[PDB]
Design an enzyme around this catalytic site. Structure first.
Site, PDB file in Angstrom:
ATOM      1  N   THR A 159       0.836  -1.312   0.038  1.00 37.58           N
ATOM      2  CA  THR A 159      -0.008   0.104  -0.035  1.00 37.58           C
ATOM      3  C   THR A 159       0.603   1.178  -0.078  1.00 37.58           C
ATOM      4  OG1 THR A 159      -1.938  -0.990   0.814  1.00 37.58           O
ATOM      5  CG2 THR A 159      -1.805   1.153   1.022  1.00 37.58           C
ATOM      6  N   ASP A 687      22.270   1.887  -9.948  1.00 35.19           N
ATOM      7  CA  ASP A 687      21.337   2.898  -9.783  1.00 35.19           C
ATOM      8  C   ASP A 687      20.339   2.978 -11.093  1.00 35.19           C
ATOM      9  OD1 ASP A 687      23.173   3.858 -11.904  1.00 35.19           O
ATOM     10  OD2 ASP A 687      23.164   6.044 -10.767  1.00 35.19           O
TER      11      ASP A 687
HETATM   12  C1  LIG Z   1      13.783   8.152 -11.430  1.00 34.26           C
HETATM   13  O1  LIG Z   1      13.620   9.528 -11.636  1.00 34.26           O
HETATM   14  C2  LIG Z   1      14.223  10.464 -10.442  1.00 34.26           C
HETATM   15  C3  LIG Z   1      13.894  11.833 -10.477  1.00 34.26           C
HETATM   16  O2  LIG Z   1      14.286  12.309 -11.811  1.00 34.26           O
HETATM   17  C4  LIG Z   1      15.880  10.119 -10.811  1.00 34.26           C
HETATM   18  O3  LIG Z   1      16.196  10.613  -9.588  1.00 34.26           O
HETATM   19  C5  LIG Z   1      17.259  11.488  -9.997  1.00 34.26           C
HETATM   20  O4  LIG Z   1      18.751  11.579 -10.276  1.00 34.26           O
HETATM   21  C6  LIG Z   1      19.525  12.366 -10.425  1.00 34.26           C
HETATM   22  C7  LIG Z   1      20.907  11.927 -10.964  1.00 34.26           C
HETATM   23  O5  LIG Z   1      21.323  10.817 -10.167  1.00 34.26           O
HETATM   24  C8  LIG Z   1      19.869  13.071  -9.326  1.00 34.26           C
HETATM   25  O6  LIG Z   1      20.443  14.225  -9.285  1.00 34.26           O
HETATM   26  C9  LIG Z   1      21.528  14.462  -8.054  1.00 34.26           C
HETATM   27  O7  LIG Z   1      20.957  15.773  -7.198  1.00 34.26           O
HETATM   28  C10 LIG Z   1      21.733  15.426  -6.181  1.00 34.26           C
HETATM   29  C11 LIG Z   1      20.909  16.392  -5.169  1.00 34.26           C
HETATM   30  O8  LIG Z   1      19.864  15.900  -4.707  1.00 34.26           O
HETATM   31  C12 LIG Z   1      19.048  16.660  -3.910  1.00 34.26           C
HETATM   32  O9  LIG Z   1      17.985  17.448  -4.488  1.00 34.26           O
HETATM   33  C13 LIG Z   1      17.183  16.727  -5.034  1.00 34.26           C
HETATM   34  C14 LIG Z   1      16.114  17.802  -6.190  1.00 34.26           C
HETATM   35  O10 LIG Z   1      15.658  18.542  -4.965  1.00 34.26           O
HETATM   36  C15 LIG Z   1      16.151  15.778  -4.342  1.00 34.26           C
HETATM   37  O11 LIG Z   1      15.035  15.162  -4.671  1.00 34.26           O
HETATM   38  C16 LIG Z   1      17.108  14.629  -3.535  1.00 34.26           C
HETATM   39  O12 LIG Z   1      16.421  13.899  -2.632  1.00 34.26           O
HETATM   40  C17 LIG Z   1      17.040  12.877  -2.608  1.00 34.26           C
HETATM   41  O13 LIG Z   1      17.859  12.534  -1.364  1.00 34.26           O
HETATM   42  C18 LIG Z   1      16.862  12.436  -0.357  1.00 34.26           C
HETATM   43  C19 LIG Z   1      17.660  11.427   0.836  1.00 34.26           C
HETATM   44  O14 LIG Z   1      18.853  12.287   1.320  1.00 34.26           O
HETATM   45  C20 LIG Z   1      15.649  11.620  -0.219  1.00 34.26           C
HETATM   46  O15 LIG Z   1      14.804  12.160   0.609  1.00 34.26           O
HETATM   47  C21 LIG Z   1      14.890  11.697  -1.697  1.00 34.26           C
HETATM   48  O16 LIG Z   1      14.077  10.463  -1.544  1.00 34.26           O
HETATM   49  C22 LIG Z   1      15.981  11.612  -2.754  1.00 34.26           C
HETATM   50  O17 LIG Z   1      16.804  10.133  -2.678  1.00 34.26           O
HETATM   51  C23 LIG Z   1      17.057   9.443  -3.727  1.00 34.26           C
HETATM   52  O18 LIG Z   1      18.167  10.250  -4.675  1.00 34.26           O
HETATM   53  C24 LIG Z   1      19.340   9.990  -4.252  1.00 34.26           C
HETATM   54  C25 LIG Z   1      20.558  10.807  -5.374  1.00 34.26           C
HETATM   55  O19 LIG Z   1      20.350  12.242  -5.023  1.00 34.26           O
HETATM   56  C26 LIG Z   1      19.838   8.662  -3.962  1.00 34.26           C
HETATM   57  O20 LIG Z   1      21.328   8.525  -3.456  1.00 34.26           O
HETATM   58  C27 LIG Z   1      18.982   8.017  -3.158  1.00 34.26           C
HETATM   59  O21 LIG Z   1      19.173   6.553  -2.785  1.00 34.26           O
HETATM   60  C28 LIG Z   1      17.397   8.078  -3.388  1.00 34.26           C
HETATM   61  O22 LIG Z   1      17.488   7.386  -4.567  1.00 34.26           O
HETATM   62  C29 LIG Z   1      18.458  15.478  -2.913  1.00 34.26           C
HETATM   63  O23 LIG Z   1      17.843  16.117  -1.774  1.00 34.26           O
HETATM   64  C30 LIG Z   1      23.075  16.014  -6.374  1.00 34.26           C
HETATM   65  O24 LIG Z   1      23.976  16.251  -5.365  1.00 34.26           O
HETATM   66  C31 LIG Z   1      23.732  15.092  -7.563  1.00 34.26           C
HETATM   67  O25 LIG Z   1      25.117  15.676  -7.997  1.00 34.26           O
HETATM   68  C32 LIG Z   1      26.068  15.057  -7.727  1.00 34.26           C
HETATM   69  O26 LIG Z   1      26.563  14.078  -8.885  1.00 34.26           O
HETATM   70  C33 LIG Z   1      26.787  15.064  -9.758  1.00 34.26           C
HETATM   71  C34 LIG Z   1      27.015  14.326 -11.471  1.00 34.26           C
HETATM   72  O27 LIG Z   1      26.317  15.223 -12.070  1.00 34.26           O
HETATM   73  C35 LIG Z   1      28.110  15.738  -9.948  1.00 34.26           C
HETATM   74  O28 LIG Z   1      28.185  16.725 -10.833  1.00 34.26           O
HETATM   75  C36 LIG Z   1      28.034  16.532  -8.553  1.00 34.26           C
HETATM   76  O29 LIG Z   1      29.362  16.871  -8.117  1.00 34.26           O
HETATM   77  C37 LIG Z   1      27.449  15.651  -7.225  1.00 34.26           C
HETATM   78  O30 LIG Z   1      28.447  14.894  -6.658  1.00 34.26           O
HETATM   79  C38 LIG Z   1      28.664  15.388  -5.444  1.00 34.26           C
HETATM   80  O31 LIG Z   1      28.127  14.246  -4.548  1.00 34.26           O
HETATM   81  C39 LIG Z   1      28.490  13.038  -4.528  1.00 34.26           C
HETATM   82  C40 LIG Z   1      27.615  11.982  -3.598  1.00 34.26           C
HETATM   83  O32 LIG Z   1      27.559  12.722  -2.529  1.00 34.26           O
HETATM   84  C41 LIG Z   1      30.043  12.893  -4.548  1.00 34.26           C
HETATM   85  O33 LIG Z   1      30.615  11.583  -4.197  1.00 34.26           O
HETATM   86  C42 LIG Z   1      30.863  14.024  -5.449  1.00 34.26           C
HETATM   87  O34 LIG Z   1      32.364  13.745  -5.278  1.00 34.26           O
HETATM   88  C43 LIG Z   1      30.325  15.272  -5.354  1.00 34.26           C
HETATM   89  O35 LIG Z   1      30.673  15.967  -4.153  1.00 34.26           O
HETATM   90  C44 LIG Z   1      22.791  14.849  -8.664  1.00 34.26           C
HETATM   91  O36 LIG Z   1      22.557  15.867  -9.570  1.00 34.26           O
HETATM   92  C45 LIG Z   1      18.404  13.404  -8.351  1.00 34.26           C
HETATM   93  O37 LIG Z   1      18.483  13.810  -7.010  1.00 34.26           O
HETATM   94  C46 LIG Z   1      17.475  12.438  -8.344  1.00 34.26           C
HETATM   95  N1  LIG Z   1      16.226  12.530  -7.945  1.00 34.26           N
HETATM   96  C47 LIG Z   1      15.620  11.875  -6.917  1.00 34.26           C
HETATM   97  C48 LIG Z   1      14.025  12.324  -6.401  1.00 34.26           C
HETATM   98  O38 LIG Z   1      16.020  10.951  -6.673  1.00 34.26           O
HETATM   99  C49 LIG Z   1      15.982   8.699 -10.973  1.00 34.26           C
HETATM  100  O39 LIG Z   1      17.342   8.740 -11.712  1.00 34.26           O
HETATM  101  C50 LIG Z   1      14.944   7.835 -12.179  1.00 34.26           C
HETATM  102  N2  LIG Z   1      15.478   6.619 -12.244  1.00 34.26           N
HETATM  103  C51 LIG Z   1      15.691   6.086 -13.328  1.00 34.26           C
HETATM  104  C52 LIG Z   1      16.053   4.606 -13.481  1.00 34.26           C
HETATM  105  O40 LIG Z   1      15.569   6.659 -14.371  1.00 34.26           O
HETATM  106 CA   LIG Z   2      25.074   3.189 -12.963  1.00 35.09          CA
HETATM  107 ZN   LIG Z   3      -3.174  -5.027   2.419  1.00 34.77          ZN
END
Ligand SMILES: *[C@@H]1O[C@H](CO)[C@@H](O[C@@H]2O[C@H](CO)[C@@H](O[C@@H]3O[C@H](CO[C@H]4O[C@H](CO)[C@@H](O)[C@H](O[C@H]5O[C@H](CO)[C@@H](O)[C@H](O)[C@@H]5O[C@H]5O[C@H](CO)[C@@H](O)[C@H](O)[C@@H]5O)[C@@H]4O)[C@@H](O)[C@H](O[C@H]4O[C@H](CO)[C@@H](O)[C@H](O)[C@@H]4O[C@H]4O[C@H](CO)[C@@H](O)[C@H](O)[C@@H]4O)[C@@H]3O)[C@H](O)[C@H]2NC(C)=O)[C@H](O)[C@H]1NC(C)=O
Ligand SMILES: [Ca+2]
Ligand SMILES: [Zn+2]
Ligand SMILES: NS(=O)(=O)c1ccc(C(=O)N2C[C@H]3CN(C(=O)c4cnc(OC5CCOCC5)c(C5CC5)c4)C[C@@H]3C2)nc1
Ligand SMILES: [Cl-]
Ligand code: NA
Ligand code: NA
EC number: 3.1.4.39
Length: 805
Positions: A159, A687
């Site tokens: 759910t 991912d």
């Molecule tokens: C399905 O659709 C979704 C949505 O489109 C897709 O997911 C997106 O993918 C993007 C690419 O991976 C990703 O972009 C990143 O954003 C980072 C900032 O993230 C914050 O802001 C967003 C937007 O407001 C927000 O929604 C995020 O929320 C996540 O995190 C919290 C947990 O704290 C949760 O509450 C929430 O549910 C969500 O979690 C999910 O996402 C994260 C990944 O962000 C996962 O780890 C979790 O498991 C979970 O699945 C955030 O609050 C930004 O920081 C990233 O930038 C890094 O990488 C780039 C590459 O361009 C680089 O240039 C930068 O330097 C930076 O790297 C730095 O950080 C690294 C890690 O710490 C470090 O090692 C480096 O050295 C650097 O310092 C990145 O741009 C986007 O956030 C998510 N969005 C969501 C909602 O998940 C998904 O891909 C789709 N799936 C498929 C199969 O297609």
């Molecule tokens: Ca990958």
């Molecule tokens: Zn049920």
């Protein structure tokens, strides 16, 4: 602390929630023990029931009644939903002949048709047909509006994961609600059904519809109802809100039903007790529609009737117990039931090992009713790995079964007869979709689609721009009369090189050998045009894929296949070929068993080498275009080019060889020719997105040849199979797979038998959408067809499930 001493007079079901410790009068206040003292008295009136009767007509307004049959009731907007039927000679909505709603017919001052989302927990898809005699309102919605034969939930089919997916367009792994029960190691907190922690905001990621609406200036009705507020009162509240002044009236509304899920747990999906809950749901729909009709809103509102998951037969006696497999059962925590998630009971325990646990759970009993996985090895179609809340060890449980830790858990808690949570491709987990209203089509059936697609559509229905999500926006344009979204193809980022003959044989030092000898002016111009792209129209049916990232690659032409060769990864990104119904399978001649040939178009420095495979005791190699399907003994030499070669574990070669030798020809017979595009996938961080070079964890020993984590294939033909794949005039038909590239066949319990007993079953398990493949490779397929883009987007989101009807 709430100073529950204020009052709810003139505030009943207030649209904004007031800040503690001032007491509340919104539809959620009970869930927070925070309602004002007088809430029940003023807001939850029940006097006289829910329906007018003959004698209540014309009555003097008595404000104590639940609803009114007085004259002024209409202008006040608080009549009983059956008022005009009893008191004014009107007919029920369900008794009217339906008529196409070509345009919104709305009261002055409505800036857009409102949207009402009617969610039903555990409404299995087959109830539409099997319960049709007892649901007349729902059947009228279904047959007059737009409907699907079923809608696919997300995994796990629980759910909370599914409701939050409907709200956000996101996979559970991205929105964060990965189960009904969760432990987050970064917060060191737990999320449970019972309790307070689930009210904390940090659990809930993405951007749900109600927040998307607010941020763009569309007013949303408070979506959520405290459980004890009866269904009838929820309906009346919504109808009352719809009577508000234009500047206060919300544009979107949510109604939630605990039924039929609640009963289905007790009685099983088709228990004779299941009729009454279905009757009751239909009566609620009737009340809403009679209500909208009174306000003249029944040809103005868009109504979505949608389920979260289905329901399956499950009893206590069908439980597998981890204590019949594991010696160390008190060292582990298990999230139990229709799925399994295992972690260490204590992180101070350094003698906990996932590997030995997986091994003790693998193929141990002849009819074992679950299968353990590392999360990164679960089928890619589930998208269930990229979240710290998902435990490293997972058990996929057979439909109809439960997994528990010890027998004491089951009998110290037979109660239930139904449950859900299984793999989202299972038939009994499928749910429903019906859309009815001015923006939906009239009497239309659409094919089954996934619930991740609806967030985009609800944004469309309301004129909003959607937050980034996992739907493919435009893939559901065929549900809609108007408000469609017209997307453009993504632009290609890297153009290919087209290399000619640039290197001499002797420049290659790869340790590769081939027995090629012997031979003419007729067949020499003939081989050169093949290498210039003369048969390319036969093998590249829908254009070449576009590369949507910055890289360096070559197009390579041959008699039987075309490829895009990556100079960075030292292998093709994609290989494309057509096998017609009449084509014949041959075998590899002996003089060519270990033949690998240098490719004179590609530098030694950008090539694989045979010496690395010799030195690598675990790794071997295979071919993307299979030599078995070469069109002539002379073309067969092309298939042994070093540029057609990919790394393969011997265990995986058993799978690949069977696919290439037996299955490709089988599909070509059954479907009247097929087009195949195959290639490698690299997803080391699990991912679901293409890895860059610096993300690769494994190479063939001593070399820079990176090892794929998976191999894909996209198999296309004509939807009208009376036409051959290469001469199709209309819609296409596709099935695809992402096979994990593994050093053992532990996943298949019968793998020591003949490949004809286990290979096709493994492939079916790893069925995929072309869209899953695009994410994983950074490619964009079907760039040049005669079909509309919307139709192609639909085809790219298609999943072939191999379930029965
Ligand atoms: C399905 O659709 C979704 C949505 O489109 C897709 O997911 C997106 O993918 C993007 C690419 O991976 C990703 O972009 C990143 O954003 C980072 C900032 O993230 C914050 O802001 C967003 C937007 O407001 C927000 O929604 C995020 O929320 C996540 O995190 C919290 C947990 O704290 C949760 O509450 C929430 O549910 C969500 O979690 C999910 O996402 C994260 C990944 O962000 C996962 O780890 C979790 O498991 C979970 O699945 C955030 O609050 C930004 O920081 C990233 O930038 C890094 O990488 C780039 C590459 O361009 C680089 O240039 C930068 O330097 C930076 O790297 C730095 O950080 C690294 C890690 O710490 C470090 O090692 C480096 O050295 C650097 O310092 C990145 O741009 C986007 O956030 C998510 N969005 C969501 C909602 O998940 C998904 O891909 C789709 N799936 C498929 C199969 O297609
Ligand atoms: Ca990958
Ligand atoms: Zn049920
Ligand atoms: N069936 S089960 O998995 O056993 C199970 C477990 C717990 C429960 C349970 O206690 N309950 C109590 C119920 C209250 N509830 C809700 O108010 C709600 C109603 N709409 C919702 O989504 C939107 C509405 C708008 O359009 C798209 C969908 C949501 C989303 C999670 C935030 C939440 C859902 C809770 C589950 N029910 C069933
Ligand atoms: Cl769960
Ligand atoms: Na080897
Ligand atoms: Na095996």
């Amino acid at each position: 602390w709430t100073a529950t001493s204020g009052s709810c007079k003139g505030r009943c079901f207030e649209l904004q929630e007031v800040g503690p410790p001032d007491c509340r009068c919104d539809n959620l206040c009970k869930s927070y023990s925070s309602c004002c003292h007088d809430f029940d008295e003023l807001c939850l009136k029940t006097a006289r029931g829910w329906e007018c009767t003959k004698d209540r007509c014309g009555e003097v307004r008595n404000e104590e009644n639940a609803c009114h049959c007085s004259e002024d009731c209409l202008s006040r907007g608080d009549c009983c939903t059956n008022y005009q039927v009893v008191c004014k000679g009107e007919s029920h909505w369900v008794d009217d002949d339906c008529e196409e709603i070509k345009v919104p017919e709305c009261p002055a001052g409505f800036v857009r048709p409102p949207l009402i989302i009617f969610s039903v927990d555990g409404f299995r898809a087959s109830y539409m047909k099997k319960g049709s005699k007892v649901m007349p309102n729902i059947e009228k919605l279904r047959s007059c509006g737009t409907h699907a034969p079923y809608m696919r939930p997300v995994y796990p089919t629980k759910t909370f994961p599914n409701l939050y997916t409907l709200a956000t367009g996101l996979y559970p792994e991205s929105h964060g609600i990965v189960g009904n029960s969760m432990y987050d190691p970064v917060f060191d907190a737990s999320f449970h059904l019972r309790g307070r922690e689930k009210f904390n905001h940090r659990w809930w990621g993405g951007q749900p519809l109600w927040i998307t609406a607010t941020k763009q200036g569309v007013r949303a009705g408070t979506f959520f109802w405290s459980v004890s507020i009866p269904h009838e009162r929820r309906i009346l509240t919504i109808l009352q809100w719809l009577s508000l002044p234009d500047n206060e009236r919300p544009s979107v509304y949510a109604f939630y039903s605990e039924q039929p899920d609640f009963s289905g747990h007790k009685y099983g999906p088709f228990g004779p007790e299941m009729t009454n809950p279905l009757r009751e749901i239909d009566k609620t729909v009737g009340q809403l529609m009679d209500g909208l009709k009174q306000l003249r809103l029944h040809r103005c509102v868009n109504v979505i009737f949608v389920g979260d998951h289905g329901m399956e037969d499950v009893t206590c006696d069908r439980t597998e117990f981890l204590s019949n497999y594991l010696t160390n059962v008190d060292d582990i925590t298990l999230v139990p039931g229709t799925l399994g998630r295992i972690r260490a009971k204590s992180i101070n325990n350094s003698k906990y090992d996932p590997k030995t646990i997986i091994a003790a759970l693998t193929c141990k009993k002849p009819d074992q009713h679950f299968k353990p996985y590392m999360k990164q090895h679960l089928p890619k179609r589930l998208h269930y790995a990229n979240n710290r809340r998902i435990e490293d060890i997972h058990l996929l449980v057979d439909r109809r079964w439960h997994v528990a830790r010890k027998p004491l858990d089951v009998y110290k808690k037979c109660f239930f007869q139904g449950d859900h949570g299984f793999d989202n491709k299972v038939n009994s987990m499928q749910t429903v979709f019906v859309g009815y209203g001015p923006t939906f089509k009239y009497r239309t059936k659409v094919p089954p689609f996934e619930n991740i697609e609806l967030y985009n559509v609800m944004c469309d229905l309301l004129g909003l721009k959607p937050a980034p999500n996992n739907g493919t926006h435009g893939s559901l344009n065929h549900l809609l009369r108007t408000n469609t979204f017209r997307p453009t193809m993504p632009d290609e980022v890297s153009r290919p090189n087209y290399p000619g003959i640039m290197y001499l044989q002797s420049e290659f030092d790869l340790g590769c050998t081939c027995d090629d000898k012997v031979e003419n002016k007729l067949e020499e111009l003939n081989k050169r045009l093949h290498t210039k792209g003369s048969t390319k129209e036969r093998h590249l049916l829908y254009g070449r894929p576009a590369v949507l990232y910055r890289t360096s690659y070559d197009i390579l032409y041959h008699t039987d296949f075309e490829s895009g060769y990556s100079e960075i990864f030292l292998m093709p990104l994609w290989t494309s070929y057509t096998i017609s119904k009449q084509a014949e399978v041959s075998s590899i001649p002996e003089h060519l068993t270990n033949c690998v040939r240098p490719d004179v178009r590609v530098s030694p420095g950008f090539s694989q080498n045979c010496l690395a495979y010799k030195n690598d005791k675990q790794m071997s190699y295979g071919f993307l275009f299979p030599p078995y399907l070469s069109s002539s003994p002379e073309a067969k030499y092309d298939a042994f080019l070093v540029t057609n070669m990919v790394p393969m574990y011997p265990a995986f070669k058993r799978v690949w060889a069977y696919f290439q030798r037996v299955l490709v020809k089988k599909y070509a017979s059954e479907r009247n020719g097929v087009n195949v595009i195959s290639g490698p996938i690299f997803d080391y961080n699990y991912d679901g997105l293409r890895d860059t070079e610096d993300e690769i964890k494994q190479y063939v020993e001593g070399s820079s040849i990176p090892v794929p984590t998976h191999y894909y294939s996209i198999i296309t033909s004509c939807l009208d199979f009376t036409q051959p794949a290469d001469k199709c005039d209309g819609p296409l038909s596709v099935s695809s797979f992402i096979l994990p590239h593994r050093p053992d066949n532990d996943e298949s319990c019968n793998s020591s038998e003949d490949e004809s007993k286990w290979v096709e079953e493994l492939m079916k398990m790893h069925t995929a959408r072309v869209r899953d493949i695009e994410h994983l490779t950074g490619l964009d397929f079907y760039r040049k067809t005669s079909r509309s883009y919307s139709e192609i987007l639909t085809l790219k989101t298609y999943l072939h499930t191999y379930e029965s009807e």
